[PDB]
From Swiss-Prot, chain A:
Keywords: Ribonucleoprotein, Ribosomal protein, RNA-binding, rRNA-binding
Function: This is one of the proteins that binds to the 5S RNA in the ribosome where it forms part of the central protuberance.
Family indicated by similarity: Belongs to the bacterial ribosomal protein bL25 family. CTC subfamily.
Keyword Lipid metabolism applies: no
Listed name of the protein: Large ribosomal subunit protein bL25
Superkingdom field: Bacteria
Biological processes, Gene Ontology terms: translation
A Gene Ontology term for the protein's cellular component: cytosolic large ribosomal subunit
Subunit details: Part of the 50S ribosomal subunit; part of the 5S rRNA/L5/L18/L25 subcomplex. Contacts the 5S rRNA. Binds to the 5S rRNA independently of L5 and L18.
From Swiss-Prot, chain B:
Protein family: Belongs to the universal ribosomal protein uL11 family.
Keywords from the UniProt entry: Methylation, Ribonucleoprotein, Ribosomal protein, RNA-binding, rRNA-binding
Taxonomic classification: Bacteria, Thermotogati, Deinococcota, Deinococci, Thermales
Role summary: Forms part of the ribosomal stalk which helps the ribosome interact with GTP-bound translation factors.
Entry's Gene Ontology molecular function annotations: large ribosomal subunit rRNA binding; structural constituent of ribosome
Quaternary data: Part of the ribosomal stalk of the 50S ribosomal subunit. Interacts with L10 and the large rRNA to form the base of the stalk. L10 forms an elongated spine to which L12 dimers bind in a sequential fashion forming a multimeric L10(L12)X complex.
GO cellular component labels: cytosolic large ribosomal subunit
Name of the protein described by the UniProt record: Large ribosomal subunit protein uL11
BP term (GO), one: translation
Superkingdom assignment: Bacteria
Modifications the protein undergoes after translation, according to the UniProt entry: One or more lysine residues are methylated.
Curated annotation (Swiss-Prot), chain C:
Protein name, per record: Large ribosomal subunit protein uL16
The keyword Ribonucleoprotein is annotated on this UniProt entry: yes
Its job: Binds 23S rRNA and is also seen to make contacts with the A and possibly P site tRNAs.
Pfam families named among the record's database cross-references: Ribosomal_L16
Length: 187, 147, 134
RNA sequence: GCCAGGGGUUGGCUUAGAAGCAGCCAUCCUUUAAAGAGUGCGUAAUAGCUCCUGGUCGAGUGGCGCCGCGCCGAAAAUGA
C-alpha cells in the first residue's frame, strides 16, 4: 500500500483538518519530521491495510519510506482520526502486530456456540524482510470451553513472538439465549 | 389420447393398503373405484417388495388415477442400512448412524430409472447429500484421484 | 457490589474519556448524547437483544453502573436521599461503546442493537470495526 | 412493463395435519442459456397466483452512508 506523503511545518493543526488533510508524524532512531496525509486517500489505504501491512510514504523528495502505523489517535465522538504515527524501518529486527486467520469451524460452533476471538493479531518481533500477511491457526478441535494459547501457533521461519507464550489467542464460548432468561431474572 | 384433472402426492407401503388417512381425505372426497383400480395395485406390488412407495397419483378426467409406481424417497434408502424408521432430530451435533459411501453406490441404482439424473457419479452425492441434512455422514477412498 | 453508600451528583462534562473503540465482537453500539444510564435500562436492552437471537451470539455489556442514583420519599428537606429507587447508574458520555455483539451476521447484529437503542434514552449509532485498533 | 414455459423433494424432524411455506435442524445433485432443499399469501393438508428463463424493449439503475434547510410527532380552557 503506497500513499502520497506531504510535509507539514508551522501550519496550524486544525486548519489542516479544514483541508481534509489529517496531520501526522514519521520518525525513528535516525529521524524526526512533521507530516500530513489526505484523509480520503489515507482511509482507503488504511482500512484494507491497517497496522499489519507496511505503508510506503512518498515525499516531495522522491523518497520511498517503509513506515508502520505505530499508533493513530482518534476523535471520540464520531469515530474519526486526528493524528497518525509512522515508524520508519530499515532491516534490523522490529516488533509489530500480525493479522490472524482461523480456518474451519471448531467442535464448538458446529455443534452450537459462538467463536470468541480474543485477538485478531499477535505481537511478533520480526525484520522488515519478513512481514507475514496472516498466521494460520487450525482451530478445528476446540471444544466448548477449551482455548488455543500463544504456545501453539504456525510460526513461520525466523519469526519469534513477543508476548507471553501463555497469553491466550482466543476461546470457544457458550451461546447465550432466551432459555436462560427464565432462570436469569428468576433467582 | 387421454384426460386428467389434478395432481396429488401420497406416501404409503407397496402391497398392504387400506382407505385409512391421509389417503382418506384424499381419494375419498373425490370418489374412487377401488374395485378395479386396486387390481392394478396388487399386480404392481405382486413381486415388488415393501417400502414407502409414493405412487405419483394424478386424478384423471374420468374420476380415476394415473398409478405410476415410483422409487422410494431418499429417506428410505439410508435407513435401509441403519434399520431405523425415521431420522435424526438435529442433523449436525448428534449422529444416529455412520453408513458408508459404498452402500450409497448400489442403493442408488434403484433411484435412477425414475429420477431425472444421468450417470451414477452424480447419483452418489444425491444419496450422500440428502443424508447430510438428516443426521448421517460417510467415508470415502477413491474420490477425485487426479494428479 | 461493595463501594460505600450514596455518592454526589456530579456533572456530565464534555466527552473527554467518555468514549472508546470497539474491543469485543464484530459490530458495536455507542452513545451520541451524555446521560445517566440506569440498571433496568441496560437490562431492557440485554433481554431484547437475546430475545431476538435465541441460541444466537454472545453479548458484551461494556459499560457498568456503579453510581448510586439517589431520590427522596415524596416530602421535603431533612437529610439526603435514602434514594436507590432506580438504583445504580453509569456516566455515559458521547463516543462511548455500550454493547458488543458477535456470532451474528449483519442483519442479525444490526436489528439487534437498533432495538436496544430504542430501550435507550439517548441517540445511538451502530458500528462495524473498520480497522482502528491500537 | 410484457408474451410464453413455470425433477428425486412430499428435504430430514416433530405433529391429529406440517406437501418450498406453525416449530426445530440444516449448506445435495440433475434437464438447462433458468428455476433458492426456498420470498409472501393461501388450503385442514394440497394445488395455485408471485418474488425462472428467452425474446421484445431500449438506457441506465438499485441500495448505502453524511451534510444545509424543512415536514409529521404538536390537544386547553375570555379573542386572536
Amino acid at each position: 500500500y503506497r500513499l502520497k506523503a506531504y510535509y507539514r511545518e508551522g501550519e496550524k493543526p486544525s486548519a489542516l483538518r479544514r483541508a481534509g488533510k489529517l496531520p501526522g508524524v514519521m520518525y525513528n532512531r535516525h529521524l524526526n519530521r512533521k507530516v500530513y496525509v489526505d484523509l480520503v486517500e489515507f482511509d482507503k489505504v488504511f482500512r484494507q491495510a491497517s497496522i499489519h501491512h507496511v505503508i510506503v510514504l512518498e515525499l516531495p523528495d522522491g523518497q520511498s519510506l517503509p513506515t508502520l502505523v505505530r499508533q493513530v489517535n482518534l476523535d471520540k465522538r464520531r469515530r474519526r482520526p486526528e493524528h497518525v504515527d509512522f515508524f520508519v524501518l530499515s532491516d534490523e529486527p522490529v516488533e509489530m502486530y500480525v493479522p490472524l486467520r482461523f480456518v474451519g469451524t471448531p467442535a464448538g460452533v458446529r455443534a452450537g456456540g459462538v467463536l470468541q476471538e480474543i485477538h485478531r493479531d499477535i505481537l511478533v518481533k520480526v525484520s522488515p524482510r519478513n512481514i507475514p500477511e496472516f498466521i494460520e491457526v487450525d482451530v478445528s478441535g476446540l471444544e466448548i470451553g477449551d482455548s488455543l494459547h500463544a504456545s501453539d501457533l504456525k510460526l513461520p521461519p525466523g519469526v519469534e513472538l513477543a508476548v507471553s507464550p501463555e497469553e491466550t489467542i482466543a476461546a470457544v464460548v457458550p451461546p447465550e439465549d432466551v432459555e436462560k432468561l427464565a432462570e436469569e431474572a428468576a433467582a | 389420447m387421454k384426460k386428467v384433472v389434478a395432481v396429488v402426492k401420497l406416501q404409503l407401503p407397496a402391497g398392504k393398503a387400506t382407505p385409512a388417512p391421509p389417503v382418506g381425505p384424499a381419494l375419498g372426497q373425490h370418489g374412487a373405484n377401488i374395485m378395479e383400480f386396486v387390481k392394478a395395485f396388487n399386480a404392481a406390488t405382486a413381486n415388488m417388495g415393501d417400502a414407502i412407495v409414493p405412487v405419483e397419483i394424478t386424478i384423471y378426467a374420468d374420476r380415476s388415477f394415473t398409478f405410476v409406481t415410483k422409487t422410494p424417497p431418499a429417506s428410505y434408502l439410508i435407513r435401509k442400512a441403519a434399520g431405523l424408521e425415521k431420522g435424526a432430530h438435529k442433523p449436525g451435533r448428534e449422529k444416529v448412524g455412520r453408513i458408508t459411501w459404498e452402500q450409497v453406490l448400489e442403493i442408488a441404482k434403484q433411484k435412477m430409472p425414475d429420477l431425472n439424473t444421468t450417470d451414477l457419479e452424480a447419483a452418489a452425492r444425491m444419496i450422500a447429500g440428502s443424508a447430510r441434512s438428516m443426521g448421517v455422514e460417510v467415508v470415502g477412498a477413491p474420490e477425485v484421484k487426479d494428479a | 457490589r461493595m463501594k460505600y453508600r450514596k455518592q454526589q451528583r456530579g456533572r456530565l462534562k464534555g466527552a473527554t474519556k467518555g468514549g472508546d473503540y470497539v474491543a469485543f465482537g464484530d459490530f458495536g453500539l455507542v452513545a451520541l448524547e451524555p446521560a445517566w444510564i440506569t440498571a433496568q435500562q441496560i437490562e431492557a436492552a440485554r433481554v431484547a437483544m437475546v430475545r431476538h437471537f435465541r441460541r444466537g451470539g454472545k453479548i458484551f455489556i461494556r459499560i457498568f453502573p456503579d453510581k448510586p442514583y439517589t431520590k427522596k420519599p415524596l416530602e421535603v428537606r431533612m437529610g439526603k436521599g435514602k434514594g436507590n429507587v432506580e438504583g445504580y447508574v453509569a456516566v455515559v458520555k458521547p463516543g462511548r461503546v455500550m454493547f458488543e455483539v458477535a456470532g451474528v451476521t449483519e442483519e442479525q447484529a444490526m436489528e439487534a442493537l437498533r432495538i436496544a437503542g430504542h430501550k435507550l434514552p439517548i441517540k445511538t449509532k451502530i458500528v462495524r470495526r473498520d480497522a482502528y485498533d491500537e
